[PDB]
Amino acid sequence: VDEANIETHGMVPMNRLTDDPRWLPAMSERVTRMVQRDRNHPSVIIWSLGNESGHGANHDALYRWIKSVDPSRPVQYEGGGADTTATDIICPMYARVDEDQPFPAVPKWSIKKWLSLPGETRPLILCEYAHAMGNSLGGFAKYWQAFRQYPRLQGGFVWDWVDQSLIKYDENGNPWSAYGGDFGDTPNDRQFCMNGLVFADRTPH
Amino acid sequence: MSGIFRDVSLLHKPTTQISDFHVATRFNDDFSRAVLEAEVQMCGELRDYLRVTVSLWQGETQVASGTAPFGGEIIDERGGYADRVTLRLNVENPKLWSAEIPNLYRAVVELHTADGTLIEAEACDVGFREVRIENGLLLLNGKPLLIRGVNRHEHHPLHGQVMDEQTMVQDILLMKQNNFNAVRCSHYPNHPLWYTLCDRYGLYVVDEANIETHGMVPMNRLTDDPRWLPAMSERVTRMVQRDRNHPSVIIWSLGNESGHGANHDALYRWIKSVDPSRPVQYEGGGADTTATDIICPMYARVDEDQPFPAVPKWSIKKWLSLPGETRPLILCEYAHAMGNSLGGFAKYWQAFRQYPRLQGGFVWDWVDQSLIKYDENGNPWSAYGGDFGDTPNDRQFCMNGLVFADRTPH
C-alpha cells in the first residue's frame, strides 16, 4: 500500500496545514508526484493520501484527483477519524474489537460496532493494531478471531515491523541500542519510537 | 382449543352508515404542527345533502373540527369516488403518543343530515405518532427506538384460551411495571379490547397476521404455493383493516415461522400499498427475507453464530455487518424463559445499548402455558404437555413462561 508523504501530527488543530487552501499546492506534489512514479507497479493495491494529517479540504480534493487520474486503486485515508468521505475504506487506527472509546469529534468504536454504524457500507481495514512495543500483541488473538468472523473486516496492518534504534558506541566501543534522545536531542520521546515486532539487526521479538 | 373463545354480539346499522373510516397523521420535521386526515366510506344509498363531520377532542376540550360533502379528490381517471369523503384537520403542538405517555386524542366520525340530523356516529381513539424507518434505524416520533418487548400468548389456565378483561389489565400492568414498554402478540391478532388498552396505557404493540406453518416440510410450501394465496390473503388483509386505526400498533407482521413463500412477498407489498404508515417485519426465510423491512432473527446469539444450511444464523453484531445490509434489526425472540432462563440476558441488553442499529428484541415468553387439573382431592395442579394424554405431547416445552399463569413472577 503506497502512502503519500504527508503527515501533520504537530499542528493544532492538526487539520490546519491540510485544511488551508494555500497549502494545497505543496500538498498536491506529494500525492500527485507519487501516483505517476508508483502507478505502474503490479503489487500496489491501494493509494493512501495522508497519515495522521487530520481531515482537510485538500484531502477531499486530493482524493478526487487520484480517482480521476487513476481509477484502478481504492483510496484510503486515516485522518478525520477514518470515517472521512475521502477514504474509500474505513481505516480506524488502534481500534478495539471488544470496546470503543470516543474522543469528542473523533469517536472510536469497536470494529464490529463501526461497520454497523448507520449509513455505513465501506469495507474496514485498520491502519494499525496490536502495538508491538516492548511486550505487545496481547489480545492479538481476539483481533484475528474477529477478522475471520466478519466478511466485511479485511484485517489490519500490525505496527510495527522493525523497532527503531540507533547504534551507539561505548568507550569500549561495544554497540548498545539507543532509544529516544540518547544523543540528548530534546525533547526526546525516548523509548516509544522503536515500536518493533522484530529486532533491527534484525532478530524476531 | 376449538370452540368459540370470543364474544358474540349483535350490531345495528342505519341503512345509510359508514362501513369503514381511516385516520392518518402527518407531521412537520419540527413536529409542531401535524395534519390529520380521515377517509370515510359510506355503505349503500348516497345522498348529496348528507355530510360527514369529524371532531377531534382532547381531554374534555376539542382541538379541531372537520366537515365535508360526500366524495373527494377526483381519483384517476374515470371518476371521483362517489361514496368516499376525505377530511383534513390541522393540529399544532399536538401531544404525541408514546410508550411513556399515551397522549391520546379522541376522534368522532359523525354522518349527519344537511339540516341536519345525524344518521350514525363513530368514535375512534387517536394517538399522534409517526413511525418510520430512516437510515436503517427504526424511528418513532423522530427518536431512535430501543424496544424491550415480551412475546405475549393470550392464555388463561382457569379459562383457557378466552381472556378475562381483567387479565389483560393485570398482564399490562406487570409488563409496564417491569420496565417493558413494548408488547408483541405471537402469533395471532389479540382480543379487540387489548389494542385499546395499550393505547391508553402506554406500551407499543406489534400486530401479527394469523399465519403459521411450522409443520409443513418444506415449511414454506403452504405459503409458497400460488393456490394457497387466497386463504393466506384473508389473514393479512382482514387484519389490517380491523387493527389499522389503533394508535398503539407500530408494526405489521405477515407471518410467524411460515418460512419464505412467494405469497409473503406479494402480501408484504400489499400491506405497504394499502397502508404506508407501519413498517412490515417477517421472521421467516431466515429473517433476511426481502419482505421484512427490519431483520428479525429469532434466538440469535450475540457472541456467536450457528448456521443451518439455507438458514444461516449469526451473532446480532455480525448480522447487521453483513454485506449489503442496511435494515434495523429487532429479534422476534430472545432469552428463552423456560424453566431457569434468561442466563446471559445481560449480554444481550449490553449489546443493544452498544449498537445504534440494534433496536432490541421481544423476550419469550410472558406467560407460561399450563392448564389446571384436578386431583381426586380436587386440588389444582398445573399440567405441562399432554398430561391429558393427547399425543404425541411436546409436554413441558409449551409453558415457556417469564411469569406464572395465575399469575406469579418467575
User: Domain limits of chain A?
Assistant: 1-205
Q: Are A179 and A191 in contact (CB under 8 A)?
A: yes
- Find, in chain B, the residue whose alpha carbon is nearest to that of A97: B317
Judge: A116–B317 Cβ closer than 8 Å, yes or no.
yes
> Is position B93 annotated in a ligand binding site?
no
> Is position B283 annotated in a ligand binding site?
no
Concerning whether A3 is annotated as a catalytic residue, the answer is: no
- Separation of alpha carbons B302 and B297, rounded Å: 11
Q: Determine phi and psi for B55, rounding to 5 degrees.
A: -120, 130
- Separation of alpha carbons B52 and B126, rounded Å: 18
- Separation of alpha carbons A52 and A80, rounded Å: 8
- Find, in chain A, the residue whose alpha carbon is nearest to that of B320: A116
- Separation of alpha carbons B307 and B314, rounded Å: 7
Q: Are B124 and B143 in contact (CB under 8 A)?
A: no
Q: How many residues does chain B have?
A: 410
Judge: A113–B324 Cβ closer than 8 Å, yes or no.
no
Q: Determine phi and psi for B240, rounding to 5 degrees.
A: -65, -45
Q: Give the distance from residue A153's alpha carbon to the nearest chain B alpha carbon, in angstroms.
A: 9
- Separation of alpha carbons B281 and B254, rounded Å: 7
Burial tier of B205 (Cβ tally within 10 Å: 0-12, 13-18, 19+): buried
Q: How many CB atoms lie within 10 A of CB B53?
A: 17
- Separation of alpha carbons B173 and B63, rounded Å: 30
Bridge partners (DSSP) of residue B269 are none
Do strands B104-112 and B118-127 pair parallel, antiparallel, or not at all (unpaired)?
Answer: antiparallel
List residues of chain B with CB under 8 Å from any CB of chain A: 135-137, 315, 317-318, 320-324, 326, 354-358
Distances B182 to A156, B150, B210, B361 between C-alpha atoms, Å: 41, 7, 20, 9
Place of cell 485522518: A79
Q: Return the CA Rg of chain A.
A: 19
Q: Give the distance from residue A129's alpha carbon to the nearest chain B alpha carbon, in angstroms.
A: 20
- Separation of alpha carbons B74 and B76, rounded Å: 6
SS3 content of chain A, % helix, strand, coil (to 5): 25, 15, 60
- Separation of alpha carbons A93 and A82, rounded Å: 8
- The SS3 assignment for A83 reads coil
DSSP secondary structure code for residue A134 in this structure: S
| Count of A-B CB contacts under 8 Å | 39
Please tell us whether the domain made up of B130-410 is placed in CATH 3.30.540.10.
Answer: no
- Find, in chain B, the residue whose alpha carbon is nearest to that of A153: B321
Q: Are B280 and B249 in contact (CB under 8 A)?
A: no
For helices B165-177 and B192-201, what crossing angle results, to 10°?
40
- Separation of alpha carbons B253 and B240, rounded Å: 10
What's the grid cell of residue B368?
407460561
Q: How far from the centroid of its chain's Cα atoms is residue B98's Cα? A: 15
Judge: B357–A149 Cβ closer than 8 Å, yes or no.
no
> What one-letter code names the amino acid at B344?
G
User: Which of A89, A96, A116 is the best residue to mutate to test the B interface, defined by the most B CB atoms within 10 Å of its own CB?
Assistant: A116
- B84-92: strand order across its sheet: B18-27, B33-42, B84-92
Concerning whether B333 is annotated as a catalytic residue, the answer is: yes
Place of cell 388498552: B197
User: Which of B318, B326, B358, B359 is the best residue to mutate to test the A interface, defined by the most A CB atoms within 10 Å of its own CB?
Assistant: B318
Q: Determine phi and psi for B51, rounding to 5 degrees.
A: -130, 150
DSSP secondary structure code for residue A133 in this structure: S
The CATH topology of domain B15-129 is Immunoglobulin-like (2.60.40)
Which method was used? cryo-EM
Place of cell 349503500: B44
Q: Peptide bond preceding B218: is omega within 30 degrees of 0, i.e. cis?
A: yes
Judge: B317–A117 Cβ closer than 8 Å, yes or no.
no
**Residues in B touching A121 (Cβ below 8 Å):** 324, 326
Q: Are B129 and B141 in contact (CB under 8 A)?
A: yes
Assign domain A1-205 to a CATH class: alpha beta
Q: Are B145 and B138 in contact (CB under 8 A)?
A: yes
Residue B259 contacts by C-beta under 8 Å, 6 or more apart in sequence?
B213, B216, B218, B219, B220, B221, B223, B224, B284, B285
Looking at the partner chain, which of B136, B321, B354 has a beta carbon nearest the beta carbon of A150? B321
Q: How many CB atoms lie within 10 A of CB B50?
A: 20
**Residues in B touching A112 (Cβ below 8 Å):** 317-318, 321
Bridge partners (DSSP) of residue B62 are B57
Residue B104 contacts by C-beta under 8 Å, 6 or more apart in sequence?
B58, B97, B125, B126, B127, B199, B200, B247
Distances B49 to A124, A168, B77, B322 between C-alpha atoms, Å: 67, 106, 25, 60
Q: For residue B380, give the nearest of B406, B400, B399 by alpha carbon.
A: B406
> Is position A129 annotated in a ligand binding site?
yes
- Separation of alpha carbons B299 and B310, rounded Å: 17
List residues of chain A with CB under 8 Å from any CB of chain B: 110, 112-113, 115-119, 121, 149-153
Judge: A116–B326 Cβ closer than 8 Å, yes or no.
no
Judge: B135–A119 Cβ closer than 8 Å, yes or no.
yes
Judge: A113–B326 Cβ closer than 8 Å, yes or no.
no
- The SS3 assignment for A184 reads coil
Three-state SS string over chain B comes to: CCCCCCCCCCCCCCCCCEEEEEEEEEECCCCCEEEEEEEEEECCCCCCCCEEEEEEEECCEEEEEEEEECCECCCCCCCCECCEEEEEEEEECCCECCCCCCCEEEEEEEEECCCCCEEEEEEEEEEECCEEEECCEEEECCEECCCCEEEECCCECCCECCCCHHHHHHHHHHHHHCCCCEEEECCCCCCHHHHHHHHHHCCEEEEECCCECCCCCCCHHHHHCCCCHHHHHHHHHHHHHHHCCCCCEEEEECCECCCCCHHHHHHHHHHHHHCCCCCECCCCCCCCCCCCCCECCCCCCCCCCCEECCEECCCHHHHHCCCCCCCCECCCCECCCCCCCCCCHHHHHHHHHHCCCECCCEECCCECCCEEEECCCCCEEEECCCCCCCCCCCHHHHCCCCECCCCCEC
- Separation of alpha carbons B133 and B356, rounded Å: 13
Q: Determine phi and psi for B247, rounding to 5 degrees.
A: -65, -35
- Separation of alpha carbons B320 and B296, rounded Å: 11
**Residues in B touching A116 (Cβ below 8 Å):** 317, 320-321, 355-358
Distances A156 to A10, A111, A117, A123, A144 between C-alpha atoms, Å: 25, 11, 19, 11, 9
**Residues in A touching B358 (Cβ below 8 Å):** 116
Do strands B371-374 and B380-383 pair parallel, antiparallel, or not at all (unpaired)?
Answer: antiparallel
Longest Cα separation, chain A: 63
Q: Resolution of the coordinates in A?
A: 3.2
Q: How many residues does chain A have?
A: 205
**Residues in B touching A115 (Cβ below 8 Å):** 320-321
Judge: A116–B324 Cβ closer than 8 Å, yes or no.
no
Do strands B149-152 and B143-144 pair parallel, antiparallel, or not at all (unpaired)?
Answer: unpaired
Q: How far from the centroid of its chain's Cα atoms is residue B147's Cα? A: 14
**Residues in B touching A142 (Cβ below 8 Å):** none
